[PDB]
Design a protein around this ligand. Structure first.
Ligand SMILES: Cc1c2c(c(O)c3c(O)cccc13)C(=O)[C@]1(O)C(=O)C(C(N)=O)=C(O)[C@@H](N(C)C)[C@@H]1C2
Ligand SMILES: Cc1c2c(c(O)c3c(O)cccc13)C(=O)[C@]1(O)C(=O)C(C(N)=O)=C(O)[C@@H](N(C)C)[C@@H]1C2
Ligand SMILES: [Mg+2]
Ligand SMILES: [Mg+2]
Ligand SMILES: [Mg+2]
Ligand SMILES: [Mg+2]
Lengths: 200, 200
């Protein structure tokens, strides 16, 4: 199962999530398709394993530092999650709809516990963490897909742009989406603060 | 171009975004593939058109009501966007990375103008709108992909779950993701309020 992930990751960056086929993986592994099907129950199982391995390799801020604020942790954790998702073609797509793996239980429990220790209810701490995750996934996928489309997509017409949209597009072309992402992350954290403060 | 979208939408729900192929669309249209290629420059152009049409058909809260607060508008707009994305298989996937179409310019300009009239800078109003969009896309895609995986994905092991994760999973299995979504939306709006308030 170790080398299979490594080959599948290499294949996935070369052909994308859609092109990560049984035929093509079995070819890369040097084996008959029936053998690949035997040990890897299906594509969804493979994708699940890739989602875990991508965070294992590249998500380096999964735990709070000693004495770190929850605000700081959420920000650093989100930036790390983003960096991990961006490392591979369709990395964010691979993650979508997964649930924590057994190897991640201690990590995600620590995050949940950290929120409750800071005074969030489990439900609200979960919803905050979920909001950060969903926002980050959406921001990453929009960025990755926009970049991927540049080749196929006609230069969009500017002769009839209204003023604010015209300015907005200029702002968005000024970087890769990172500024927007950091601003949204801060909006979320400011929101969680308001909410937490009221309840306590 | 009208009937093509209609057939492609019907095909897309039956075979997904990946299965929306030239071969298969040309077959559904009753035409040779070279004819389909002629008028539809490529798949990305088709997907772009589908993204516009899906909102045209089902996104019914694109404009603020007379006298409506920006907080209320963002919430109602987000709920509507979600409802539209959820209507079709891979609707959220179709949207990813698109930019406003000429037919949408007046609509998105109105939204941007509404934020600036309420005291947001154009940049901050844009980043707020972008945050709502990214969060909604991420929440929808996670929900849709989780549901789609239920068939292929083994019943995940519960014998070694830690307490907070165990409770979190029970909370998440209690609905389809809507409660989490509404909570995250409120966190975002509370955050934007804090930010706007400080600046003014
Ligand atoms: C707590 C939790 C998390 C995630 C998650 O999917 C999830 C779930 O599906 C059900 C119940 C709880 C969770 C994350 O994916 C994950 O990305 C993650 O696995 C994770 C991780 N493994 O380190 C994180 O850093 C978290 N962060 C991005 C908010 C978040 C934590
Ligand atoms: C303003 C804006 C929007 C969107 C968008 O993609 C975008 C962009 O890519 C660049 C610059 C501005 C925008 C939306 O997709 C869209 O979904 C949308 O098209 C849209 C719409 N057409 O009605 C919306 O309702 C908006 N809402 C979900 C926040 C948002 C507005
Ligand atoms: Mg792709
Ligand atoms: Mg996850
Ligand atoms: Mg699918
Ligand atoms: Mg958009």
């Amino acid at each position: 199962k170790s080398k299979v992930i490594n080959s599948a990751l290499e294949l996935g960056n070369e052909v994308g999530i859609e092109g990560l086929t049984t035929r093509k993986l079995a070819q890369k592994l040097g084996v008959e398709q029936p053998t690949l099907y035997w040990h890897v129950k299906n594509k969804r199982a493979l994708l699940d394993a890739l989602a875990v391995e991508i965070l294992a390799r590249h998500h380096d801020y999964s735990l709070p530092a000693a004495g770190e604020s929850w605000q700081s942790f959420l920000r650093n954790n989100a930036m790390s999650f983003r960096r991990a998702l961006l490392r591979y073609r369709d990395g964010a797509k691979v993650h979508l709809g997964t649930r924590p793996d057994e190897k991640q239980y201690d990590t995600v429990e620590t995050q949940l516990r950290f929120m409750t220790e800071n005074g969030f209810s489990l439900r609200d701490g979960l919803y905050a963490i979920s909001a950060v995750s969903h926002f980050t996934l959406g921001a990453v996928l929009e960025q990755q897909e926009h970049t991927a489309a540049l080749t196929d997509r006609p230069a969009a017409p500017d002769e009839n742009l209204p003023p604010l949209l015209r300015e907005a597009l200029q702002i968005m072309d000024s970087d890769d989406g990172e500024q927007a992402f950091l601003h949204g992350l801060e909006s979320l954290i400011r929101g969680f603060e308001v909410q937490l403060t009221a309840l306590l």
